[PDB]
């Protein structure tokens, strides 16, 4: 009783382990919450119907920053705790966010009890728990609401509970309100009862089985727009009253999307209603609470005068994502946070297939490869992780919501689908979701259901699946099933991403390596980090002679294939559907670049964006010289697939901003010239309108921002005119949404426009328009102004605090601000902790937002120092090492190819 931890009051806490005990299993929660929005208080009470599997003396729960007032225990099966039951003694042990209740006599197996507590707290001033949010009306009034955000482990800041995702229970929620407000929660309201003083009591329908983190309840002012799905779900979009205009497309798109998901999964959405509500103060982008999905206004609200088409594509993708959570994450929750990718990676993947299903016009298929490329940069560093990986503390759990669980999870799924086909892939996910509905799954569970997918409706006679035959196919289906489950599991447990090397003989030797950046092949530690890595990569390839795609699994470090027609070139990873990079040896890279400059149309357009990415990443690998990747961008002047064109330019624009930050004004002036002159035709075709289709529109904003970011004399002139008209018309005129952001940042370049822009930020009713405005403000060249912006965001009264993170990142992007942001962060690191969690995305982004672009040996030392200073104070985050590898990789890239870039650009001048 000594090595045991000590509760406050000084006692021995019965448990001392980070997890909870699987002996008292919660079945049903009766939750009564009564918040006061004038006091900014809440009073609440709860009765948990629990089951005991094993005899115990002590009950262990989660509670945090909650004052428990009263603790009792009753039963209708165990006589001893007969009505009105017995009082419990409460021991709190905050270090593990656990609360221990002791009973006067041990309890009985297979007998259900009722645990009751009365507790109270203040509404949070953060972005978690049961917190306080605030919005501005059109009149200029300020109103309050109370809102919940619990994922992953802040449910316990609102009510005591078994805050782990496997402890699934039903929830019955009563909420007390003034007549001024309404109350929402996960399920439909069945009753509202008049109370003595004048207050009302909302009783909500008791929920289905679900994890704690999804519970939701809201008290507020809002207005709604309703519609019904083909399955008869009442969908409603909620926002502050003056913003109900902007709420119309969210309703149209969510109806179409809930329809798509029900038919695709062959599973009806189980609740009667579904609510989407735009929360003014919202840290995450959105959250998927079952039947009560919360968003930032930017995620959900669309206004047609001030939102761009790209804005529309973003709003429609979050709705897509959140709605995919109702099955992946709510209908089937992962067993533990270690397999969080089971929720997020699958949800992210269904954004693709559903947005492509219901809004092809938005041309989202063409931008999905960007999801893969974004994680590939981090999976090329040794600081990455395998998809599934242990996590125990609340900060580690938060860390798990990254590019790995989300993007990598989705790219390995999309790779696996190409392998099996939509028909086999769909039927596999329907079997998964039906089988695990209302309970949890672990990583291994999924691969079994996807591996044993049945291609069609189970052909009873004589089938390959169920009800009955024994054939040679049957030994191959059973045999290919365990081929796929073996394959996927190594992608799941191996950090990193493979590099397929292809040497074309007379008739193809294949080698497999762990792709790595920074580190070169000759380097001392390159052979040390290639240890033990091997993937079952499902390859693809097509050749110069025929469009036929050949598919060849590879399960060894070396292999070789025989080419029949011995054609001009071979291209592996067709449409880049596979999570790997191909490097060609000896006039095979040269062969493909030859094609791109003659008929680039003899390679399908995903192959072209695939090569463009692979080419530059191999320059990062050192396996290629920069002259070759720049030699490929030559063809881009004939390029017609807008995705390949913008992928290409993006790299070139990358370089310019890199040079500009380091003051290298020879190269970032020829870079300026090479873009403006070589791509002058495509730039000058663009409107200053909203006139085209979605890739026309999306391509117009892209190029015009490019030209105005390079101070192209004409485009800066047209933008400043448009800004003046808008300012001199007191907003009576309108600016096309595609150039809205460009115009604002042009205007921001004088104090007059900047000050007007800030003053008209406070009065806008479109949070898209604000988001664009704040960017424009962040492009000021006066450090006097940037500092104001950052201080306004620290304050949080004008520029809301859910923007201080992305603001800092914006300021840091541009040269005049990359320091001031760095200085600020190190000078107020402790203040920034009192506003955000150490594992929050707001901190991970504040950190790399201001450091990860550094590319000099001298800056790295500062950062390593600052990070050490932090780890010294007990703060550790994986993001630390990731930045350092990134900063390091930047230094090596400059050291190895800066002369080549400089020389390549001068050479182009001559022709
Ligand atoms: C959160 O707390 C706020 C206060 O911080 C609270 O608002 C207050 O509610 C009380 C209770 O309803 C109000 O006090 C009453 O006001 C009415 C007039 O509106 C008076 O008539 C009351 O006195 C009589 O009431 C009875 C009849 O109903 C009589 O039988 C009795 O004998 C009295 O003669 C009493 O003064 C108070 O006005 C508000 N505060 C305001 C409006 O500023 C709010 O209700 C709480 N919210 C929740 C959800 O709990
Ligand atoms: C906790 O959540 C659980 C879900 O995870 C709930 O379990 C569900 O409970 C319901 C009710 O017992 C079961 O519903 C079944 O539905 C059929 C069809 O109902 C028929 O009768 C009605 C009445 O007129 C009619 O309207 C219908 O159309 C049908 O004609 C019933 O016949 C069954 O007996 C059964 O009631 C679900 O199957 C069940 N699902 C699961 C996964 O367990 C549980 O109820 C929740 N607990 C609490 C206390 O609410
Ligand atoms: N801007 C972002 O990418 C933020 C970054 C972030 C912030 C906080 C946590 C995790 C990630 N993503 C979200 O807020 C997420 C994921 C996501 C991606 C997209 C997206 C939509 C359209 C187009 C591109 C997109 O990427 N929309 O949402 C909503 P979730 O459904 O998984 C929910 N259960 C998250 C729960 C959570 C809350 C607090 C801590 C930890 C986890
Ligand atoms: C780069 O290669 C492509 C091949 O994919 C070239 O386009 C193709 O050119 C041939 C030759 O004209 C077309 O063949 C067909 O000939 C008959 C004979 O009259 C005619 O009736 C057909 O309609 C067609 O012209 C082939 O179809 C054509 N493909 C397409 C999609 O038009 C391309 O022209 C080459 N590069 C350049 C710069 O031309
Ligand atoms: C995106 O949507 C399109 C919808 O047409 C898909 O393309 C079709 O896919 C079906 C299979 O469901 C094929 O039989 C058709 O021939 C395709 N038509 C066209 C015009 O391409 C496309 O596959 C979808 N992409 C994803 C990833 O789901
Ligand atoms: C507790 O559960 C375990 C599970 O292994 C079981 O063996 C045991 O009999 C149960 N009861 C007690 C008192 O441990
Ligand atoms: C326990 O709850 C009852 C009911 O509200 C209350 O009267 C009592 O004060 C509470 N706690 C005690 C007496 O310790
Ligand atoms: C809200 O909707 C109606 C729809 O016709 C429109 O006439 C009204 O002006 C709108 N108000 C705002 C502020 O957009
Ligand atoms: C790479 O990561 C491994 C695994 O965490 C670690 O053992 C090693 O120190 C790291 N090395 C480098 C050079 O990053
Ligand atoms: Zn998600």
mmCIF file of N, CA and C in Angstrom, residues 222-257:
data_model
loop_
_atom_site.group_PDB
_atom_site.id
_atom_site.type_symbol
_atom_site.label_atom_id
_atom_site.label_comp_id
_atom_site.label_asym_id
_atom_site.label_seq_id
_atom_site.Cartn_x
_atom_site.Cartn_y
_atom_site.Cartn_z
ATOM 1 N N UNK A 222 -29.935 28.807 -32.257
ATOM 2 C CA UNK A 222 -29.720 28.716 -33.700
ATOM 3 C C UNK A 222 -31.038 28.515 -34.452
ATOM 4 N N UNK A 223 -30.980 28.689 -35.779
ATOM 5 C CA UNK A 223 -32.077 28.403 -36.701
ATOM 6 C C UNK A 223 -31.670 27.231 -37.609
ATOM 7 N N UNK A 224 -32.643 26.604 -38.278
ATOM 8 C CA UNK A 224 -32.350 25.377 -39.003
ATOM 9 C C UNK A 224 -33.064 25.346 -40.352
ATOM 10 N N UNK A 225 -32.574 24.473 -41.252
ATOM 11 C CA UNK A 225 -33.222 24.136 -42.519
ATOM 12 C C UNK A 225 -33.347 22.623 -42.633
ATOM 13 N N UNK A 226 -34.559 22.141 -42.881
ATOM 14 C CA UNK A 226 -34.803 20.710 -42.888
ATOM 15 C C UNK A 226 -35.106 20.151 -44.275
ATOM 16 N N UNK A 227 -34.765 18.873 -44.434
ATOM 17 C CA UNK A 227 -35.114 18.041 -45.564
ATOM 18 C C UNK A 227 -35.069 16.584 -45.168
ATOM 19 N N UNK A 228 -35.729 15.770 -45.984
ATOM 20 C CA UNK A 228 -35.751 14.328 -45.831
ATOM 21 C C UNK A 228 -35.030 13.621 -46.973
ATOM 22 N N UNK A 229 -34.355 12.537 -46.603
ATOM 23 C CA UNK A 229 -33.637 11.659 -47.507
ATOM 24 C C UNK A 229 -34.634 10.682 -48.115
ATOM 25 N N UNK A 230 -34.175 9.899 -49.085
ATOM 26 C CA UNK A 230 -35.023 8.846 -49.603
ATOM 27 C C UNK A 230 -35.304 7.779 -48.559
ATOM 28 N N UNK A 231 -34.410 7.596 -47.588
ATOM 29 C CA UNK A 231 -34.684 6.641 -46.526
ATOM 30 C C UNK A 231 -35.532 7.235 -45.417
ATOM 31 N N UNK A 232 -35.888 8.511 -45.500
ATOM 32 C CA UNK A 232 -36.732 9.113 -44.489
ATOM 33 C C UNK A 232 -36.013 9.659 -43.275
ATOM 34 N N UNK A 233 -34.746 10.064 -43.405
ATOM 35 C CA UNK A 233 -34.050 10.753 -42.319
ATOM 36 C C UNK A 233 -34.296 12.254 -42.432
ATOM 37 N N UNK A 234 -34.647 12.874 -41.317
ATOM 38 C CA UNK A 234 -34.814 14.322 -41.300
ATOM 39 C C UNK A 234 -33.439 14.957 -41.077
ATOM 40 N N UNK A 235 -32.933 15.564 -42.097
ATOM 41 C CA UNK A 235 -31.644 16.216 -42.018
ATOM 42 C C UNK A 235 -31.859 17.685 -41.711
ATOM 43 N N UNK A 236 -31.019 18.263 -40.859
ATOM 44 C CA UNK A 236 -31.195 19.666 -40.526
ATOM 45 C C UNK A 236 -29.855 20.381 -40.407
ATOM 46 N N UNK A 237 -29.774 21.566 -40.978
ATOM 47 C CA UNK A 237 -28.558 22.343 -40.963
ATOM 48 C C UNK A 237 -28.820 23.531 -40.055
ATOM 49 N N UNK A 238 -27.996 23.664 -39.023
ATOM 50 C CA UNK A 238 -28.176 24.649 -37.964
ATOM 51 C C UNK A 238 -27.076 25.694 -38.015
ATOM 52 N N UNK A 239 -27.443 26.946 -37.796
ATOM 53 C CA UNK A 239 -26.463 28.026 -37.744
ATOM 54 C C UNK A 239 -27.061 29.193 -36.972
ATOM 55 N N UNK A 240 -26.243 30.223 -36.703
ATOM 56 C CA UNK A 240 -26.826 31.394 -36.074
ATOM 57 C C UNK A 240 -27.906 31.942 -36.998
ATOM 58 N N UNK A 241 -28.847 32.705 -36.438
ATOM 59 C CA UNK A 241 -30.055 33.068 -37.204
ATOM 60 C C UNK A 241 -29.773 33.869 -38.479
ATOM 61 N N UNK A 242 -28.892 34.874 -38.418
ATOM 62 C CA UNK A 242 -28.595 35.670 -39.601
ATOM 63 C C UNK A 242 -27.846 34.894 -40.676
ATOM 64 N N UNK A 243 -27.358 33.688 -40.370
ATOM 65 C CA UNK A 243 -26.550 32.923 -41.315
ATOM 66 C C UNK A 243 -27.316 31.769 -41.981
ATOM 67 N N UNK A 244 -28.631 31.673 -41.747
ATOM 68 C CA UNK A 244 -29.430 30.601 -42.337
ATOM 69 C C UNK A 244 -29.433 30.657 -43.874
ATOM 70 N N UNK A 245 -29.421 31.863 -44.516
ATOM 71 C CA UNK A 245 -28.977 31.924 -45.929
ATOM 72 C C UNK A 245 -27.880 30.956 -46.299
ATOM 73 N N UNK A 246 -26.765 30.920 -45.562
ATOM 74 C CA UNK A 246 -25.591 30.195 -46.085
ATOM 75 C C UNK A 246 -25.679 28.681 -45.899
ATOM 76 N N UNK A 247 -26.797 28.227 -45.415
ATOM 77 C CA UNK A 247 -26.936 26.896 -44.901
ATOM 78 C C UNK A 247 -27.565 25.986 -45.953
ATOM 79 N N UNK A 248 -27.829 26.498 -47.173
ATOM 80 C CA UNK A 248 -28.659 25.781 -48.149
ATOM 81 C C UNK A 248 -27.899 24.677 -48.896
ATOM 82 N N UNK A 249 -26.619 24.894 -49.243
ATOM 83 C CA UNK A 249 -25.895 23.861 -49.999
ATOM 84 C C UNK A 249 -25.485 22.689 -49.116
ATOM 85 N N UNK A 250 -25.179 22.973 -47.846
ATOM 86 C CA UNK A 250 -24.924 21.915 -46.887
ATOM 87 C C UNK A 250 -26.102 20.954 -46.788
ATOM 88 N N UNK A 251 -27.323 21.465 -46.865
ATOM 89 C CA UNK A 251 -28.475 20.570 -46.846
ATOM 90 C C UNK A 251 -28.598 19.783 -48.134
ATOM 91 N N UNK A 252 -28.370 20.440 -49.277
ATOM 92 C CA UNK A 252 -28.519 19.747 -50.552
ATOM 93 C C UNK A 252 -27.474 18.640 -50.682
ATOM 94 N N UNK A 253 -26.230 18.948 -50.324
ATOM 95 C CA UNK A 253 -25.161 17.970 -50.477
ATOM 96 C C UNK A 253 -25.232 16.851 -49.446
ATOM 97 N N UNK A 254 -25.756 17.121 -48.248
ATOM 98 C CA UNK A 254 -25.777 16.062 -47.244
ATOM 99 C C UNK A 254 -26.899 15.062 -47.518
ATOM 100 N N UNK A 255 -28.020 15.549 -48.039
ATOM 101 C CA UNK A 255 -29.076 14.662 -48.520
ATOM 102 C C UNK A 255 -28.558 13.693 -49.588
ATOM 103 N N UNK A 256 -27.871 14.211 -50.614
ATOM 104 C CA UNK A 256 -27.341 13.360 -51.679
ATOM 105 C C UNK A 256 -26.297 12.386 -51.133
ATOM 106 N N UNK A 257 -25.530 12.847 -50.154
ATOM 107 C CA UNK A 257 -24.449 12.041 -49.633
ATOM 108 C C UNK A 257 -24.979 10.960 -48.689
#
